[PDB]
């Protein structure tokens, strides 16, 4: 009898043209109800707790299972959890999952890579103040017109950010680093010396 308030609350957001998903306007309302910027990290966290497949929509099962898992039948209970969830992102292993989730969440379904502009936007979001070289990294990619970002390069950039020194000296010129990261270093090394 707990699903009662939850089913009703789902009906608030469901796409009129598809009962099995929360659509564009529904996502806009859901965010509006939470008093959050749709594009905020806080919304991203919620989707990550929902285990959402693709940005800008939730399946009827993504919403119900997710809210159920957090034990929330309202939008205030959800809000009350935000910080406890946002803090949840201190754990290194928990943040990695979130970070890697961001890739598959952000990209188009059925395509292997992530478009550059979306990747930058999502990097700014998740990796802001985690990465000393973010600004230079995005610029690097924009200037050379790499149109797409592979999963391998996305996932490993995290590890790169964790271990790279202010002067990049500890970076081994051999490495097991994906080409794109290595190119960045060979570009970025002069700019810091």
């Amino acid at each position: 009898g707990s699903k009662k308030k939850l089913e009703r609350l789902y009906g608030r957001y469901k796409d009129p043209q598809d009962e099995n998903k929360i659509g564009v306007d529904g996502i806009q309302q859901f965010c509006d109800d939470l008093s959050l910027d749709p594009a905020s990290i806080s919304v991203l966290v919620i989707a990550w707790k929902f285990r959402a497949a693709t940005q800008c929509e939730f399946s009827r099962k993504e919403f119900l299972d997710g809210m159920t898992e957090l034990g929330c039948d309202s939008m205030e209970k959800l809000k009350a959890l935000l910080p406890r969830l946002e803090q949840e992102l201190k754990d290194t292993a928990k943040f990695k999952d979130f970070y890697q989730f961001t890739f598959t969440f952000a990209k188009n379904p059925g395509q292997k890579g992530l478009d550059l502009e979306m990747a930058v936007a999502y990097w700014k979001l998740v990796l802001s103040g985690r990465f000393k070289f973010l600004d230079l990294w995005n610029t690097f990619l924009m200037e050379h017109h790499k149109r797409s970002i592979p999963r391998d390069t996305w996932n490993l950039l995290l590890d790169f950010g964790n271990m790279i020194a202010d002067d990049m000296s500890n970076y081994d010129e051999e490495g097991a680093w994906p080409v794109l990261i290595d190119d960045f270093v060979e570009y970025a090394r002069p700019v810091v010396t």
């Binding site: 564009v24 996502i27 806009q28 965010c31 594009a39 989707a47 940005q55 800008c56």
Partner: peptide, 11 residues
């Protein structure tokens, strides 16, 4: 939901 603005202006 970065793409939500573009997807609203497109629908």
């Amino acid at each position: 939901m970065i793409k939500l603005f573009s997807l609203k202006q497109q629908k």
